[PDB]
Amino acid sequence: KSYKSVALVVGVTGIVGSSLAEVLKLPDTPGGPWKVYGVARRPCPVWLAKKPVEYIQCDVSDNQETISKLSPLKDITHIFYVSWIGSEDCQTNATMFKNILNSVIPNASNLQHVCLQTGIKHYFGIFEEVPHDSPFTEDLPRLNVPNFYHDLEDILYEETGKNNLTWSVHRPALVFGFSPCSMMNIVSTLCVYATICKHENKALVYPGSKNSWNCYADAVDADLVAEHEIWAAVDPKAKNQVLNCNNGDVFKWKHIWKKLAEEFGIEMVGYVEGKEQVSLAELMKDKDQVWDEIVKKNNLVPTKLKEIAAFWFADIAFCSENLISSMNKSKELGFLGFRNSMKSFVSCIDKMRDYRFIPAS
Amino acid sequence: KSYKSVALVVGVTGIVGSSLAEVLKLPDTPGGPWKVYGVARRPCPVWLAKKPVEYIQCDVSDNQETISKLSPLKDITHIFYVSWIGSEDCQTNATMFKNILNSVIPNASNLQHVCLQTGIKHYFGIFEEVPHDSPFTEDLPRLNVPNFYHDLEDILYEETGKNNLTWSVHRPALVFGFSPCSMMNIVSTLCVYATICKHENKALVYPGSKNSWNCYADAVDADLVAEHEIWAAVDPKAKNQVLNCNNGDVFKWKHIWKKLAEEFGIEMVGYVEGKEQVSLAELMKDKDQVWDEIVKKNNLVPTKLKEIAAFWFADIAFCSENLISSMNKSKELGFLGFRNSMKSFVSCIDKMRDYRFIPAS
Ligand SMILES: NC(=O)c1ccc[n+]([C@@H]2O[C@H](COP(=O)([O-])OP(=O)(O)OC[C@H]3O[C@@H](n4cnc5c(N)ncnc54)[C@H](O)[C@@H]3O)[C@@H](O)[C@H]2O)c1
Ligand SMILES: NC(=O)c1ccc[n+]([C@@H]2O[C@H](COP(=O)([O-])OP(=O)(O)OC[C@H]3O[C@@H](n4cnc5c(N)ncnc54)[C@H](O)[C@@H]3O)[C@@H](O)[C@H]2O)c1
Numbered sequence: 001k002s003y004k005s006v007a008l009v010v011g012v013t014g015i016v017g018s019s020l021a022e023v024l025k026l027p028d029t030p031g032g033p034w035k036v037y038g039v040a041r042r043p044c045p046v047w048l049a050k051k052p053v054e055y056i057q058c059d060v061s062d063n064q065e066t067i068s069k070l071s072p073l074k075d076i077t078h079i080f081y082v083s084w085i086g087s088e089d090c091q092t093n094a095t096m097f098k099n100i101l102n103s104v105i106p107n108a109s110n111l112q113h114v115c116l117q118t119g120i121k122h123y124f125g126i127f128e129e130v131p132h133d134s135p136f137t138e139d140l141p142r143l144n145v146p147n148f149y150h151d152l153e154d155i156l157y158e159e160t161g162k163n164n165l166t167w168s169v170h171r172p173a174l175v176f177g178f179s180p181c182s183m184m185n186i187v188s189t190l191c192v193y194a195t196i197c198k199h200e201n202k203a204l205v206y207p208g209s210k211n212s213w214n215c216y217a218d219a220v221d222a223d224l225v226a227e228h229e230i231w232a233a234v235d236p237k238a239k240n241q242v243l244n245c246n247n248g249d250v251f252k253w254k255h256i257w258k259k260l261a262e263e264f265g266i267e268m269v270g271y272v273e274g275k276e277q278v279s280l281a282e283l284m285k286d287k288d289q290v291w292d293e294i295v296k297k298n299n300l301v302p303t304k305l306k307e308i309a310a311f312w313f314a315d316i317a318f319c320s321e322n323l324i325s326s327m328n329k330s331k332e333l334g335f336l337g338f339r340n341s342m343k344s345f346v347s348c349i350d351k352m353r354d355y356r357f358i359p360a361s
Numbered sequence: 362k363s364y365k366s367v368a369l370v371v372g373v374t375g376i377v378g379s380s381l382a383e384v385l386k387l388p389d390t391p392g393g394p395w396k397v398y399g400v401a402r403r404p405c406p407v408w409l410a411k412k413p414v415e416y417i418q419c420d421v422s423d424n425q426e427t428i429s430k431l432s433p434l435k436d437i438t439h440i441f442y443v444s445w446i447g448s449e450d451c452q453t454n455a456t457m458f459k460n461i462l463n464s465v466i467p468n469a470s471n472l473q474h475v476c477l478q479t480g481i482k483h484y485f486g487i488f489e490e491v492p493h494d495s496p497f498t499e500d501l502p503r504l505n506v507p508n509f510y511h512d513l514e515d516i517l518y519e520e521t522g523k524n525n526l527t528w529s530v531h532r533p534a535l536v537f538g539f540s541p542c543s544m545m546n547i548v549s550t551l552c553v554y555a556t557i558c559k560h561e562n563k564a565l566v567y568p569g570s571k572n573s574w575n576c577y578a579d580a581v582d583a584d585l586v587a588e589h590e591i592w593a594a595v596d597p598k599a600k601n602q603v604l605n606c607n608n609g610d611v612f613k614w615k616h617i618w619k620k621l622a623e624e625f626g627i628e629m630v631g632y633v634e635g636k637e638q639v640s641l642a643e644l645m646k647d648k649d650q651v652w653d654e655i656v657k658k659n660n661l662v663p664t665k666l667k668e669i670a671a672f673w674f675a676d677i678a679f680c681s682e683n684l685i686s687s688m689n690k691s692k693e694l695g696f697l698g699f700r701n702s703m704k705s706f707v708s709c710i711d712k713m714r715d716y717r718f719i720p721a722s
């Protein structure tokens with residue numbers, strides 16, 4: 001075909017990358033019809049080979065490999081950088097993004113826009129070792145921390161300015177999504193926990209803090225992040241803006257916890273007054289084998305426990321509070337996409353069952 | 362003229378009534394062009410006589426008076442009940458609403474819809490002497506309290522069902538609005554407080570609780586409540602629904618407090634750790650004369666202190682928390698109106714200065 005737009009999705013197996021791969025191929029999608037190149041680290045997993053994306057395995061931290069794999073991609077119009085290296089290292093994250101731009105900018109003559117996805121950590125700090133108060137708005141100045149987001153933005157602003165490309169930064173809230181290859185997928189994580197509770201005839205027992213149980217929290221659906229990125233990539237009113245992305249509402253983990261129990265047909269144990277947070281990472285230490293049994297029993301897409309779940313990240317979610325972000329700027333710019341967070345959560349569950357990452361019920 | 366729609370706005374001098382009087386007369390307003398009858402208790406105040414509304418002074422708690430004043434209004438198509446009696450008495454509030462319906466339903470042959478405005482108290486209780494947890498959604502069952510909202514809804518459902526009229530219930534959050542004739546106008550109240558602090562060379566000192574300072578809160582702009590009521594009154598997808606109404610975002614009183622100080626060019630004293638709530642009602646006990654001086658000095662529309670301000674209500678706002686409501690249902694039905702609450706607050710300030718209820722600066 002000829003296409004209207006050609007996307008390079010860096011991080012296609014990711015929690016947002018995998019949604020963009022679906023969303024960009026819908027016929028109503030702005031800027032369409034879209035060709036999609038999808039970059040990720042590992043060989044194309046099976047679930048993705050059944051999608052119309054041109055998959056490129058590439059270590060994007062390796063400059064020569066990245067040049068050789070992406071230089072030839074002359075038709076690219078829009079880059080969606082929806083990746084990170086899996087640690088908070090400013091240098092290695094920065095290298096990834098620089099490699100992408102240095103490989104594509106000089107070879108793709110119709111390149112228009114670079115979309116960079118970071119996150120609300122911008123506002124409160126990093127996962128190793130202060131915060132702005134919320135609701136977080138986009139104009140809040142950088143914290144004095146080595147946040148790799150600062151380096152990515154600086155690279156973005158430099159490279160796009162000197163090459164007359166447009167840019168956007170997206171700072172999603174906690175993502176409700178479906179990919180089993182993510183390093184930070186709260187829903188799969190909690191789904192795996194519940195699946196194990198069920199298999200071991202235990203209750204869905206809440207391991208988190210009191211505050212996280214009771215405080216207002218927010219999130220974003222992966223598909224909404226993809227729409228928001230696509231919107232900023234094609235709508236000229238949105239160009240060259242930093243932009244938060246959340247579902248537009250708030251929830252409480254306590255209400256989510258109940259729905260999770262109901263979705264797995266098991267009993268729930270809520271937060272208990274005075275009792276304190278225990279580490280779900282520690283509780284799930286040596287469950288790799290139970291998970292390998294479950295995968296085989298239900299004929300699931302095979303995943304290692306440490307791949308599909310990130311219990312450490314759940315622990316952080318469950319000692320967090322006061323992290324609400326504002327969608328006012330996006331709405332004032334005309335983006336009115338939203339989701340009902342309770343429904344988005346359930347819909348991630350359904351979809352992970354649908355795609356056979358977790359057991360049906 | 363002939364008109365497309367004819368509104369009876371019961372409570373036209375109110376915080377929402379007064380916005381409907383403006384909003385219904387805009388040329389782009391759904392269901393327009395609109396004729397507007399406006400009912401309130403007192404003689405038409407001066408500011409309202411300069412508006413194209415047919416003003417009807419009527420004590421709507423008096424059945425015979427109400428019949429004689431509203432029976433002749435044969436052209437009415439839509440009732441907007443945006444009033445209450447000023448106490449929590451279930452019987453006297455109920456009488457008001459029944460009188461309206463009994464006077465209009467049998468005489469207005471093209472009557473289509475009755476819009477009833479109650480509020481988020483539905484979810485947490487009454488102001489004299491439990492709560493549902495939030496975010497509040499519309500399906501939450503009634504609390505076991507004598508809330509006059511229950512009586513108003515019961516009357517609404519009975520009268521509309523037996524007469525093939527459509528209905529809606531609107532449960533606004535705390536209203537950001539401009540009317541000086543309201544019994545519950547948080548912005549005018551805080552504006553009056555700041556005006557007095559300024560006049561007496563004092564700082565804008567926060568009198569409220571720690572929690573109210575730091576917790577997430579929400580509100581609605583009066584104009585947005587009017588749009589939402591108008592939407593439910595004309596859009597067939599919205600018919601016969603209970604519906605919350607808020608600005609679609611959240612704020613904190615602490616950030617609002619700072620903006621309030623800035624808007625009045627005075628110094629702020631925020632919440633002080635360990636210090637506890639004092640009653641602003643008590644602090645403003647005998648300031649009626651200072652206010653009468655200020656009104657005369659700045660040639661303001663004359664208001665009595667107890668009319669324009671409701672310090673008791675500010676005290677309640679400042680010991681409240683956990684009252685967020687969800688707009689998901691309205692959004693899922695297609696209503697995407699919203700406001701930036703910080704901007705809505707400032708815009709109420711500006712408008713009260715514009716209309717000369719409070720001093721310019
Ligand atoms: N997951 C969340 O809830 C969440 C929330 C807010 C912000 N974010 C931010 O979004 C950004 C992207 O994170 P994510 O969670 O979407 O990531 P993810 O873990 O879901 O996906 C990572 C992707 O990057 C690829 N990748 C990693 N190293 C690579 C390399 N050397 N070469 C090529 N590909 C490589 C992976 O294969 C994968 O496709 C991060 O800054 C993250 O902090 C994530
Ligand atoms: N003000 C708020 O912040 C707020 C917030 C949420 C819900 N609500 C609810 O909205 C509803 C309407 O309240 P409001 O705050 O819009 O009221 P308001 O105090 O701003 O207006 C009251 C109106 O009713 C009229 N009225 C009172 N007694 C009357 C009588 N006997 N005859 C004729 N008119 C009479 C008044 O003249 C006035 O126009 C109430 O249930 C209230 O609890 C208010």
Ligand SMILES: C/C(C=O)=C\CC/C(C)=C/C=O
Nearest residue numbers: 119120121173174316317320
């Ligand atoms: C830990 C937490 C809990 O709500 C929210 C942070 C979510 C993410 C991945 C932020 C990235 O910047």
Ligand SMILES: C/C(C=O)=C\CC/C(C)=C/C=O
Nearest residue numbers: 480481482534535677678681
């Ligand atoms: C007191 C308060 C503080 O936020 C909110 C209640 C606002 C109103 C008038 C509710 C009516 O049902």
